[PDB]
């Protein structure tokens, strides 16, 4: 199989035009931000990563035509999954099994997570690394990644929105694009599309666990005041 080249669905070509290179997001967040892991700094880093995701959504086809109430509902249903997918893809590209790469460029040894993290977080980090391994084995590429981000953003049943038609059409176009692209570019991975949808089931499971970790921190009064992920958690 091989990525890109000819025969790429229009939706995917459009999404690639809206996806910043990792180096550019890094610079932006390091700019917005400025031993034991610095907890509040990492919380601010995750908030800034979500702000970057909201900026991407704002520019996307379809999403940019929706009224604010529909935009908020979509993001309220997808924020945690978009953050998990962003972290997972960053690891797939990084390609190191003994460390994790943060959006700031910081590298964190997994041995350090075993020393510093409690059980909820340690288990979550390791479960996420298993999905990273699966996606690397499946040869997840950038075309698939951006389509998966769009699919998640638009994952909500349209009955919860004012503009049913536009979002339903976006859902259908994104599923068709991922199916067409994977079949044409990875013909010998015959069930790649289904395998990516099963990977999204795992992103949702990881997201739920991440929400439970944030809720435990919130009840313990450990989160910074006015944290954006907690606002999303309570919405």
């Amino acid at each position: 199989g091989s990525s890109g080249g000819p025969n790429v669905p229009e939706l995917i070509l459009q999404l690639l035009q809206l996806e910043p290179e990792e180096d550019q997001v890094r610079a932006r967040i390091v700019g917005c931000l400025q031993q034991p892991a610095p907890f509040s700094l990492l919380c601010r880093m995750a908030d800034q990563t979500f702000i970057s995701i909201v900026d991407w959504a704002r520019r996307c086809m379809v999403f940019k035509e929706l009224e604010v109430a529909d935009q908020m509902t979509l993001l309220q249903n997808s924020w945690s999954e978009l953050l998990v997918l962003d972290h997972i893809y960053r690891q797939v590209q990084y390609g190191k099994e003994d460390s994790i790469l943060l959006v700031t460029g910081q590298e964190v040894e997994l041995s350090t997570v075993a020393v510093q993290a409690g059980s909820l977080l340690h288990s979550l980090v390791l479960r996420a690394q298993e999905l990273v391994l699966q996606l690397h084995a499946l040869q997840l590429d950038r075309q698939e990644f951006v389509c998966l981000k769009f699919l998640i953003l638009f994952s909500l049943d349209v009955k919860f929105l004012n503009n049913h038609s536009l979002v339903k059409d976006a859902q259908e176009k994104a599923n068709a694009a991922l199916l067409d692209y994977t079949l044409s570019h990875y013909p010998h991975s015959g069930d790649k599309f289904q395998q990516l949808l099963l990977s999204l089931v795992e992103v949702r499971a990881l997201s739920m666990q991440a929400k439970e970790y944030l809720y435990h921190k919130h009840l313990g009064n450990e989160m910074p005041r006015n944290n954006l992920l907690i606002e999303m958690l309570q919405a």
């Binding site: 702000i51 909201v54 604010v68 309220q76 999303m232």
Partner: peptide
Amino acid sequence: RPTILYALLS
């Protein structure tokens, strides 16, 4: 009710 999310989208 003003929220951070609404401020990001406006």
